[PDB]
């Protein structure tokens, strides 16, 4: 039984104050998700989900996905799901953050410099050779556990190169790709990760056959980061409602603008009662990937992938 | 208790046989859908779905939908979905049907001349005007009750004007339609009532206020009839399952070209099994459905709406 979400290791560096970071029970699944629900939606406006692929006859198999805790409304910086190393101090206020936080964002970007910072910052503390070092060197070895598992390029690390991921379909085709994997590339091994899991393909191309499985891009990766918008025009409605909102910070005054329904719907909902339901959420989908014949893709273990 | 489904009243006209037309469940529920889902499988290839549409505080707001049973691979009239009047006689082989139910098509497509040829050869028998005038009359009755019913044309029929329905975005944006609308219109009041209750809006402008649940269609309208096809690529993966298949004449000698999946999935399933799931239908998408502030749209009955 291990917690294997990143941020389930912030843990306050003054040693009196407890503090317990919170996490769903997901973050106990040996999967590929290096954080955990709670988190995820608290810093990166997504949930969880799982596209469970069919077949036509009665085989089938489970893929993971995530979707947009985005609204309607919002704008500009708003948008941005996963903010590249250029802009995530701009997207996540790390001043109003604990410090074993921000440490962590920045190891995920590999801001060495702010590293180090917190560090120069926290030496002069008067119990720091006591106990301060010794929490904070603690969360910051973990944290480096987990992104050096993720990371293709380290000692030892396992890499798949029989699964193609791409998220330019008209270059993918090509086996070539584009600037938007370029992009995919520029991110730490955590993150593309992170996109990996949370973003499925427009197509899947299984040996020949190509499985398109939407026909429309819900989202799109530049410079910015990974953006919660829509490539053609006017943005999805999203109905971002109560049960995966908390109010994690009491004293913090947030506004927010609200769509309200009126008129009573009961009685409609009733005469529609016993049909089959199908979701109004904003599943990640963006791109092309490709599973050569030899791989292993059902194995249950977690390996770091990567296109030639 | 009112059994609603059309196609309820195919009845052999041949007295000694008792024809049972299994209707599901559905068939009593008093709304928009005079079909029941069974024989919207058997004839349209659709399922019947809800879309509840939430607001982002507390209200519930269902709205009918119906899903794709046409695979990544069929096209012409094994892609057709609801073939228009000059082309269902091909789509629909009504020379292998009853003719309980080739009466009830040609009257769902106004072909009076194939209604009277099937009164015609069926005057000459031995029980005509003792027991198969009355049982072919019934049927014709009760038919004609239902597409009275749905045509906003009839004598005293209730008609809503408090909602635009356009199945040309584009041309919705003035109010217009296009030709997709035009070709609309030469459907009957129950074939058009059928299309807006099976296919959803991408667009919904409830008092202004537009919100968008799809941004690329999934359905297409045209000289042919509503298809289940896309406006560009190729078509969407949609695995046909044999719980929707349904072997009604077991006599009928058919050949499938379906998907196999090999390699022991399980083991995802396990590794996924706490996870929410997506699914992977393909539901009907077309048009911009405006509300009027003033509307009444929450009503449980049934009123055959039309544009002015």
């Given at each position: 039984?291990?917690?294997?979400?990143?941020?389930?290791?912030?843990?306050?560096?003054?040693?009196?104050?407890?503090?317990?970071?919170?996490?769903?029970?997901?973050?106990?699944?040996?999967?590929g998700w290096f954080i955990c629900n709670?988190?995820?939606?608290?810093?990166?406006?997504?949930?969880?989900?799982?596209?469970?692929?069919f077949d036509e006859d009665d085989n089938?198999?489970?893929?993971?996905?995530?979707?947009?805790?985005?609204?309607?409304?919002?704008?500009?910086?708003?948008?941005?799901?996963?903010?590249?190393?250029?802009?995530?101090?701009?997207?996540?206020?790390?001043?109003?953050?604990?410090?074993?936080?921000?440490?962590?964002?920045?190891?995920?970007?590999?801001?060495?410099?702010?590293?180090?910072?917190?560090?120069?910052?926290?030496?002069?503390?008067?119990?720091?050779?006591?106990?301060?070092?010794?929490?904070?060197?603690?969360?910051?070895?973990?944290?480096?556990?987990?992104?050096?598992?993720?990371?293709?390029?380290?000692?030892?690390?396992?890499?798949?190169?029989?699964?193609?991921?791409?998220?330019?379909?008209?270059?993918?085709?090509?086996?070539?790709?584009?600037?938007?994997?370029?992009?995919?590339?520029?991110?730490?091994?955590?993150?593309?990760?992170?996109?990996?899991?949370?973003?499925?393909?427009?197509?899947?191309?299984?040996?020949?056959?190509?499985?398109?499985?939407?026909?429309?891009?819900?989202?799109?990766?530049?410079?910015?980061?990974?953006?919660?918008?829509?490539?053609?025009?006017?943005?999805?409605?999203?109905?971002?409602?109560?049960?995966?909102?908390?109010?994690?910070?009491?004293?913090?005054?947030?506004?927010?603008?609200?769509?309200?329904?009126?008129?009573?719907?009961?009685?409609?909902?009733?005469?529609?009662?016993?049909?089959?339901?199908?979701?109004?959420?904003?599943?990640?989908?963006?791109?092309?990937?490709?599973?050569?014949?030899?791989?292993?893709?059902?194995?249950?273990?977690?390996?770091?992938?990567?296109?030639?």
């Amino acid at each position: 039984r291990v917690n294997r979400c990143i941020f389930a290791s912030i843990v306050s560096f003054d040693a009196c104050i407890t503090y317990k970071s919170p996490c769903s029970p997901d973050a106990y699944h040996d999967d590929g998700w290096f954080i955990c629900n709670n988190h995820l939606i608290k810093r990166f406006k997504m949930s969880k989900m799982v596209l469970p692929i069919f077949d036509e006859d009665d085989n089938q198999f489970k893929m993971t996905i995530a979707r947009h805790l985005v609204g309607n409304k919002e704008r500009g910086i708003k948008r941005i799901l996963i903010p590249s190393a250029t802009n995530y101090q701009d997207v996540f206020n790390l001043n109003s953050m604990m410090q074993a936080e921000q440490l962590i964002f920045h190891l995920i970007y590999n801001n060495e410099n702010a590293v180090n910072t917190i560090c120069d910052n926290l030496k002069y503390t008067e119990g720091f050779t006591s106990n301060t070092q010794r929490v904070i060197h603690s969360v910051y070895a973990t944290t480096k556990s987990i992104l050096d598992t993720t990371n293709p390029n380290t000692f030892c690390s396992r890499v798949s190169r029989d699964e193609l991921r791409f998220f330019d379909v008209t270059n993918a085709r090509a086996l070539r790709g584009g600037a938007g994997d370029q992009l995919f590339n520029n991110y730490s091994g955590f993150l593309q990760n992170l996109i990996r899991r949370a973003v499925a393909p427009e197509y899947l191309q299984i040996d020949t056959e190509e499985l398109r499985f939407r026909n429309c891009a819900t989202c799109i990766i530049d410079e910015t980061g990974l953006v919660a918008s829509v490539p053609d025009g006017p943005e999805l409605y999203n109905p971002i409602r109560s049960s995966d909102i908390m109010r994690s910070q009491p004293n913090r005054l947030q506004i927010r603008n609200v769509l309200k329904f009126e008129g009573d719907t009961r009685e409609l909902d009733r005469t529609l009662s016993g049909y089959e339901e199908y979701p109004t959420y904003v599943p990640l989908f963006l791109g092309y990937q490709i599973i050569n014949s030899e791989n292993n893709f059902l194995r249950n273990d977690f390996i770091p992938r990567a296109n030639p």
